[model samples]
Target: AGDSFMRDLLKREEELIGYCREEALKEPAAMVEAVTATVWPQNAETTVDSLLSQGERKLKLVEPLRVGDRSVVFLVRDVERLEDFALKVFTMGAENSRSELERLHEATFAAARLLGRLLLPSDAVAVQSQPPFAQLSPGYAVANYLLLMPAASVDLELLFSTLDFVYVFRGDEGILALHILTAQLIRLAANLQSKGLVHGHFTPDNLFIMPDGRLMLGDVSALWKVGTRGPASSVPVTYAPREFLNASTATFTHALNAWQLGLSIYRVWCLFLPFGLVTPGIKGSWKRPSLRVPGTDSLAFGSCTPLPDFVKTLIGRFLNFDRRRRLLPLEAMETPEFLQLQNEISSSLS
Candidate 1:
């Protein structure tokens, strides 16, 4: 009876599950003979080619999750352990080459210490691939590098980006956002500046709010060696100081980084960027602080307008136009407000 019952259940499960063909659901194994297909014609490979088990940490690519100019991130499964993770692969034959990627390791290493404060786990492994240019010749081969990283189990950004968070303090969600963002920016500035790297373009898109409400910075490729101009123009224009555009003025100094953080924070606080919102952006800030902040979409806000005395003072310091007058991200960390905020995070996260 046990064998007969099991056999009948298998038959029914098989009969009802094929309505779309397993391929329609995009599962890794459709049939025993399923071949691996990845991001593109030039980049795809046989299923065996996607496996990375050589000496240790056996893993297999299940599917591609995200694509960039020179890399593709695959959602992979640990063949032996049955675990899921992400693998970011960069093709030497693709848009990025050796010299271009040579510095990535250095940048990642420098930022290692800040990773705990950094929202995402930094555990990573490097893998190599021998891809036969099946397009050029099935026998022709090239080397590609893959960066394996931990994957998130939960989706918190959706909660942060939506009214779920901003609804708390008004202006979509304020006080808590500013508090969470303050910790991240302070940590980012202190940690990056100590490593002699300046993180460029503090845009809303690059910040991720963890499920616990603390913030994490993403798109770390924005971190640049001091004095280097790396995507300096990519910052939201409305949030950048007008001086950022002047060659003589944009020195990539710590002060410059401080100014940008202040402006970016102000934009988040105000909900309206100082300049135009078209982004390449616009510049300008409140000249006289008489407690009158700006608003947008019926959505504009600034600390100056209808804010508490403490908040007005807090916002003014970060939003100042002069780098010399702005609140350096480090100094902001020493504020009693920041200490209190971190304590709150510790209590809840613990």
Candidate 2:
């Protein structure tokens, strides 16, 4: 009994030490600048004139691609390297603090580096504004944080939005495509979990189809530390577990990725989000993604193949209301379902 007590005490001490290290590591650097940039500020026009060079690499904006509420994405060219890439610049706002954006860049980029499937940013920089010419326009004084990444051809949202599986899959080849996509997603999610992180958002829009027919996670700013509780960021309610839908005090774990990945994979097949009652009740009962996966739209997929039995059962477990009951990405990869999917792809190639 005394031996067991000593062992327990040692274990507890080790756990406490690990927790302290995690807390210290998770603390982001202090805020340096007020706002990152004023790309579409109330006072100035969008300006590429105030671009800064990092070392010998100078980036020139080709054109603006997306103007989101928090940031602006631009097609930029590295003049020194003669390469084209995408640059996301944080804009001025109440929530767009420089340090916060910089931390997000660091987190996302580091994860991408660790896991190949996520879009790897070549550079992350805070636009400096010291001289009068360095100003983002006439009145904008704040600097901007930028993330540089390789350009992608299209995103899953754009591709799947057409609801034309034939256009994407081109016959039995669709099965091969689906299998590859699922496998890639499994690897990404599993690798992320291995590193003690969870990508809170796994919607189709964030999954990019690379120019070389590869799939990569385009946006990873919504990543959360596994087993931590915090205010939820912007996540699709349909993709999120009920626990994480809470604006404040929501626990995040590997299961969040499972839930989102299940829904994301389903949407790939049916081109529609699924919803159903978790419990049989006329009112007040919570809803979850339905187990009965829907077929693709006939208008778009006149003769599309139905989702396989293995996928149905696998995704159903992922959609479980209880987070603890959900099939984790790593566990899913180890299942017979994953093996079957892998075999089908290999056979198809032969």
Candidate 3:
């Protein structure tokens, strides 16, 4: 009867796990299975040979898309779906950094899942798999793993040109599109807040423009949740809020997202960085450049801009230097101008 008792306990736990997964809108069992199948036990050396062998045994690797200092991304076709997607594999340099790397992987996956949950129906984002690492013999570390997502052709030059025009002309259509995107982001932030999660690194690079014209937020490696501890060095440079720089999690408010939104919108409008530098690494000294006409540096806020007054006000509210005074995501979404812009876009599309 010992075996029978064990089976009964396993069944009960499975039920509980299913309930929790449903509540979170996640496949906890599937995640656990994937993690178990891919990640080796603690303190195992991960090797490129082992990773390649496993991939070949399971499926063929098409090509390596990105190889950075910390991670590698590969293109692969799903056996079941026959669709192309990116697999961002992570690796560990040393034992001391293993836990940190794992944390980053988890953060990235959680961020993708959270974004997916928040922006359902559009379904622009999802965590295709959990943290998967191979353990080899001791001393030789090979913590390689993958994150899967649909691939798209990113046009950085075209994106820059589009933003430049938006800033100079500030057309009504452009403002409306910006507002819709902001509303979606705010909605995502509010949902994350409800779960005590905050995206510490909210930047333009982390934002993806999908082929269907939907904006998707990516690269959530700095996600933090309430009551959870984070490593001191994991703070991102470009988008780190003052509270984060101060090392005071107590000051971890959701207002930083608004600031990031303002920054992105401003970037689109000016076709140049508002801060004059590219993601300055320092703290508190960052400042927005003086707004001027395209060919002139003179202050030109009063110029007959295509951007409506209400939209400008909304942007100003979020871009305010004082974090406490910045507009809340929920409040920003509720404004008449925000709603009207979304309606106008939907109507135009229809």
Candidate 4:
């Protein structure tokens, strides 16, 4: 009887597999087309050379930074002068065609414009010369634009490797630097909102930590008009708010950015993130290291020489899931904590 039952189960499993295969074959071509549309091919070397030729200054390839599913980022060298900068160029041949490419290009240019206007001293966000795309073949017209910004001295991952985990909460010079960076981001966000725009994507990787203690926001390719539709997969795990996982509006995206800011502060203070953060539709669970510091609640800080109450409040306000209660960028900047920190830093230099 047991042998008969085992044989029956095996037969049922085989039948189920066959049925699934048959159903997959029967699916509409549009479904397959949709999947194919997301895949983007890499640009040819000759195309890259042609694109670089349009640059005012001679461009030499340094090293590729990252090649995401849709775009590739390169660390380029100035051949005319010995200098380094980053270039994020997108390759054409994606299933989405010219419309998607145009959207990406528009978003990138918009970001450069916004960053240039908001950040004082101009050096805060560098705008490299825009290379002409007309020379490239038809499909390649959707090439990525070059972003000329300072090379990052230390990333968050590198910083963690060097500093002890305990030092994160010790409120050292690094922590002070973090406070200033956060303040600047808040100001930038306010400027974006005033112009009816939203930065849909906000992640640690997009925040570049410069050697001079300034943090600049990068990867503004996901930015869109206030009421525009956003890319489906742009929402980052842990960093983005819960509402963003579903359909998000402009105000929702802005609030979500604030959530990212909160997460950024948490990561800066504690080397590890609090929750087992996962993407929208993943199955596996993540393991976070247990908190080591004494009397440290994920939400509340103990009397162990806490950060300024107003600063803490600002982070909390940003992280607030309710968009109604979240702090606006202007309000965040005007906070006593931010003003005091800026004043103190300025006075020290004076």
- The lDDT leader among the candidates is 2
1-350 per-residue lDDT for model 1 (tens digits): 12232233224333232232232234323321122233222433222332223444556667654433344456677666677666655545544455455466455645655544343323344332433222111211212334555543212222222322123333422344444455565676667677776666555544543323344565565666778754545554444554565443354666666766655555444443443343211123323221123332122343322433444455566666566777766777787766776775455334
What's model 2's TM-score?
0.65
What lDDT tens digits, residue by residue, belong to model 3 across residues 1-350? 12232233334334443333233323233433233234333322222221212332122355444433355445555544566666554445656565765575555555556665312111111112322353322212335444556753322223443333233443454455444554555565556666676665555545554444445555555556644655433444444544455553444456766666666555444434444324222121224422211223221233222555566676677677677898866677788867765676577445
Model 4: per-residue Cα lDDT at residue 259: 66
Instruction: Give candidate 4's error at residue 155 in angstroms.
Output: 5.1
lDDT of each: 0.46, 0.58, 0.46, 0.48
Candidate 2: C-alpha RMSD after superposition: 15.8
User: Per-residue alpha-carbon lDDT of model 2 for 64-167, expressed as tens digits?
Assistant: 54433455466777776788888775544554465665566567766666656677676665434432212343132333456678976555654453334123
* Sliding window of 10 residues with minimal summed lDDT for model 2: 27-36
* Candidate 2 clashes between residue pairs 3 or more apart in a chain or in different chains: 36-143
With candidate 1 superimposed using the best TM-score fit, by how many Å does residue 340's alpha carbon deviate from the native? 8.1
Q: Estimate the lDDT of model 3.
A: 0.46
**Candidate 4 lDDT, tens digit per residue, 1-350?**
12232233234334443333233333333432222222122321112222223434445655444433444445566665687766555455666644565564555566666666211111111123323432122232334334455555433433332232122333344444445555656666677667676765555556555534455556566656665665544665455555555544423355665666666665554444435442211122234322222232346443222466666677677767676688767667777877876775455334
Which residue segments of model 4 deviate by more than 4 Å?
Answer: 1-48, 52-74, 89-150, 154-172, 210-214, 248-253, 274-306, 343-350
